[PDB]
């Protein structure tokens, strides 16, 4: 396995072996056999092998009991067994090193990436004050941050960081005892690199191909302008397990961002990416014939997928990947280039100084999730770099050439695809869209252990009002979003995100009127939308033609579907009845059928 | 809406409102219109929204994982909100007085069948010494941690407070004896104690086998799963109309008063002393009820203190036999109906002929009796003629309803004994390559399946884990071997589950079940003691040394009831299940284990 660093990794294992010395041991029975073994202690639990159910949102979509899809969103092992499983098969794999000549146009790409990414921004340290501020107005934590014990664990490790050292920063793929520790490592990552996400450093604006802080209601219009450049069709291409598939060689171009930053600041996310980075310390549970043991592992490569600063290095490392892909399908990149030790920077400084930011402007990136229009079609089989640079594409022969669409409406982006729909007044609305059955699946889902019924209620409130403002084009989600809001009280606020995508605006957590908060969105604060005329009836809100809705996953046209859309008022009634004497209002009164 | 006979029930309450003053209330916006309301308490929410899930069954199921039937299964709401749903759908209903002459053939039926019930055996009490015993011995009563109970038995302040309430039964007072909804040592021992009184009483029911087919004609007390389509096809023998099995919609709750006073006739055959203790279960518990129910508040959960004189308590010791003896009852009457002995006009008049009836049961009923299969609210009857079809007078005046078909729609027979639905299985006639004849259990693959990957709430180790499949692998071995699927991941989770390890949960509560599968005896050696050498309908006693003699399904009818042979997703997974296996092993560890797919070397 990897060859481990006992001057960076010793001290945090030697903490854990001491904070569980009555059961430490070395298990030589370790399944591990690309990640370093250190040892064992005893657990339980972690985690549970069934996710809790909201009964308010499967009462009001009773159709969705029998759809095999919508049932599995729901099914998630989180029990040793589970973890075991995943790690196993997707996270204990090797990255074989590329080739010299694949390093070496990684490097020329990575030097100009990062220039052209700073040339108005400047990095900074992130402060105390601006984490506390984040933690308040992001919903246990919050007192965390009040605490001053907190800060005085935060500052003993930052300076064990000074000193090249580290203590307490070990992450774990799974009371104050453990988790003011978690805490205190994810504000040290903060401090040194949080000023890529605060700083909006992978905005559309500052990183070309970058889509940070844009929002699913504007992906869609982002891959229809992107669809207007003239060139060959659109990839979008799945890197199978792409956080397994970072290599030594990525995390070393990722780090090159630290020649920007002042003398103080360097030495701060030095600490970050030499010890926590590029050597880390890992947690993962193990089922044993007799119980639980709780296993102490290590890596030099591979991304922490927990981590702050996961989302902007894994957009820099894929849109210097594809733009490697690019100069490889122009002819710029050979065999010979890449297995050649003495590359010349020459070829390749020429095609980033003349070439380079037209090639990022066709790209929408965002972390593993990419969607290139290259100047040709020579890029489908241009594989030779991406493959030697470990991002081998998911389910698909290593040397087959990847599909292109040649309809923007079709490509996968964001968990999404996105369809133009023509409004009765002629304007034109970009939509996003997914399976029907992954947004009522994941509805379904009550968030947490026994949550009580206003929290249940509110949280199916947040589904319906989120699918009134993205999802409005689904006849089965505007129908179940109208029966959820008829049978949730009026004054009660929608609680707990829907979502934790980076591209979701949580403007329907509120008690305003969704037809207004869809005009803000769609009208009013709509940059591709000319003509303001505000929208007053739902009666003039786009569907999705029939069809398409159909391929989607709508279950119109179904015996069963006809019966629920005719019954949900009896529905709607039985979960007033269950939440008792509240301020409710009817929304069915819309076209009723 | 309900009148409550407050000199009963008033002691039970009074006691909850004293250990719960510091929060009791009457809560003026409560949903009860069929219950008498008494008060709440706030308490700390019980129940799970989701079932926990087997990862070596879901791991060596995977074409099952799209299969909707399959992950239904695992969806039941335990928390105050499906608590609530279920009990304002089936459970706060009201079922009208049966008519005079309905109530009048109702009392003769009960008493003629209580003597024939009673003609060899003799009602006494069930023992401490015996409640003991069964509980140290996980047996059967009233069918997650039953270790709690297994302490509760030792200590003697457990039978002080039983001792304390079976005085006030005595005395024809109820101190302690309420009943809790579904779907702490000190009210732990309470819930048990309530159990014990109730067995003193009436255990004697299923501990002396009343209901078995020798002694009630129309019982399968004892019987088991694997002898049930045995007993079908003997009554498919017996001349006569079609074969019905009709549904009752939420029986428990449509047991009426009238019902519950003619249950109660056999106090009747009892000596004074047992006499006494079951007319206080009667009469203070079923006949008077008082229920513990859980509601969610938009604030919190509050626990509801409810009351009801009529309906069955579901958790009840006696539960089977008296809803066993009330269908055989109910199912007499009904053949009486169909038959011409009742009218429209019998059903009307109060001051009604014993004469015609007890004369229809002395010449006919034993007969009668023999024509059905009764377990609880499940029957299988074969009337004289199909007149029966159509009478429904009696049946939906004794409240019986029949689920999912309109009040005066005639019933459906069935031609066909393979295909009639009995205690959630059909059986299926099979003849085995030397041209002996099996008589299977079966029921949709998926129900099976379904259940299996269901992990039993708590034994979150590896080892309960793996354990809990095995028994479910195993159960497969013996009762659904004909199964192609079936015997296929059965196999493969036998394979991949250490050979040494002991099946350990039980994989069913049905009384049906005999356990037969809880061992590390070989299967097929299990599967002769069972099918062959103990089978009473198996005359030729030659043994099956090899499972290519034990038989499948027709292609055709493995299809019919949820197989997925013939999809490619399934030929994937039967060629791929080698992978599968070293999985779960390298997951469970350096263990020893077999390789039972060449059974079919390799098919
Ligand atoms: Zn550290
Ligand atoms: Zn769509
Ligand atoms: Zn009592
Ligand atoms: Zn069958």
Redesign the pocket.
């Known amino acids: 396995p990897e060859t481990p660093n006992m001057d960076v990794i010793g001290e945090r294992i030697k903490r854990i072996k001491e904070e569980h010395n009555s059961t430490w041991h070395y298990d030589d029975e370790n399944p591990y056999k690309t990640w370093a073994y250190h040892g064992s202690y005893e657990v339980k639990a972690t985690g549970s092998a069934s996710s809790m159910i909201n009964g308010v949102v499967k009462l009001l979509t009773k159709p969705w009991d029998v759809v095999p899809m919508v049932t599995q969103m729901a099914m998630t092992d989180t029990t040793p067994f589970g973890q075991q499983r995943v790690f196993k098969e997707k996270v204990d794999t090797r990255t074989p090193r590329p080739l010299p000549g694949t390093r070496k146009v990684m490097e020329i790409t990575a030097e100009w990436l990062w220039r052209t990414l700073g040339r108005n921004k400047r990095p900074r340290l992130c402060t105390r004050e601006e984490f506390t501020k984040k933690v308040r107005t992001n919903a246990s934590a919050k007192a965390a941050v009040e605490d001053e014990e907190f800060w005085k664990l935060v500052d003993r490790?930052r300076e064990?960081?000074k000193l090249g050292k580290?203590?307490?920063?070990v992450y774990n793929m799974k009371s104050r005892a453990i988790w003011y520790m978690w805490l205190g490592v994810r504000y040290?990552e903060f401090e040194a690199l949080g000023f890529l996400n605060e700083d909006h450093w992978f905005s559309r604006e500052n990183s070309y191909s970058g889509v940070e802080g844009e929002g699913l209601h504007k992906l869609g219009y982002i891959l229809r302008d992107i669809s207007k450049i003239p060139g060959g069709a659109m990839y979008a291409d799945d890197t199978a397990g792409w956080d397994t598939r970072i290599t030594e060689d990525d995390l070393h171009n990722e780090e090159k961002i630290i020649q920007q930053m002042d003398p103080e600041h360097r030495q701060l996310a030095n600490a970050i990416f030499k010890?926590?980075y590029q050597n880390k310390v890992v947690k993962v549970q193990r089922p044993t014939p007799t119980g639980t043991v709780m296993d102490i592992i290590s890596r030099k490569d591979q991304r922490g997928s927990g981590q702050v600063g996961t989302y902007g290095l894994n957009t820099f490392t894929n849109m210097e990947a594809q733009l490697v892909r690019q100069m490889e399908g122009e002819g710029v990149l050979t065999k010979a280039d890449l297995e050649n030790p003495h590359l010349l920077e020459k070829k390749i400084t020429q095609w980033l100084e003349t070439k380079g930011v037209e090639r990022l402007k066709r790209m929408a990136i965002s972390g593993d999730d990419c969607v290139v229009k290259p100047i040709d079609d020579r890029f489908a089989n241009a594989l030779l770099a991406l493959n030697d640079m470990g991002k081998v594409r998911k389910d698909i022969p290593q040397w087959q050439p990847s599909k292109g669409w040649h309809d923007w409406q079709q490509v996968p982006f964001c968990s999404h695809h996105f369809h133009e729909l023509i409004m009765k007044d002629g304007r034109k609305l970009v939509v996003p869209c997914r399976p029907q059955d992954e947004l009522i699946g994941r509805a379904r889902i009550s968030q947490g252990a026994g949550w009580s019924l206003r929290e249940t209620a509110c949280l199916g409130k947040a589904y319906a009002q989120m699918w009134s403002l993205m999802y409005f084009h689904r006849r089965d989600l505007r129908l179940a979003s109208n029966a959820i809001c008829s049978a949730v009280p009026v004054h009660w606020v929608p609680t707990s995100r829907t979502t934790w995508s980076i591209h979701a605006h949580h403007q329907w957590m509120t008690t305003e009127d969704m037809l207004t908060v869809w005009n803000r969105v769609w009208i009013e604060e709509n940059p591709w939308m000319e003509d303001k005329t505000p929208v007053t009836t739902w009666e003039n809100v786009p569907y999705l033609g029939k069809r398409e809705d159909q391929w989607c996953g709508s279950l119109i046209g179904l015996t069963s579907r006809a019966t629920w859309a005719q019954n949900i008022p009896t529905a709607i009634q039985q979960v007033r009845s269950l939440i008792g004497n509240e301020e409710f209002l009817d929304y069915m009164p819309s076209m009723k059928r």
């Open positions: 490790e064990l960081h580290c203590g307490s920063c040290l010890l926590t």
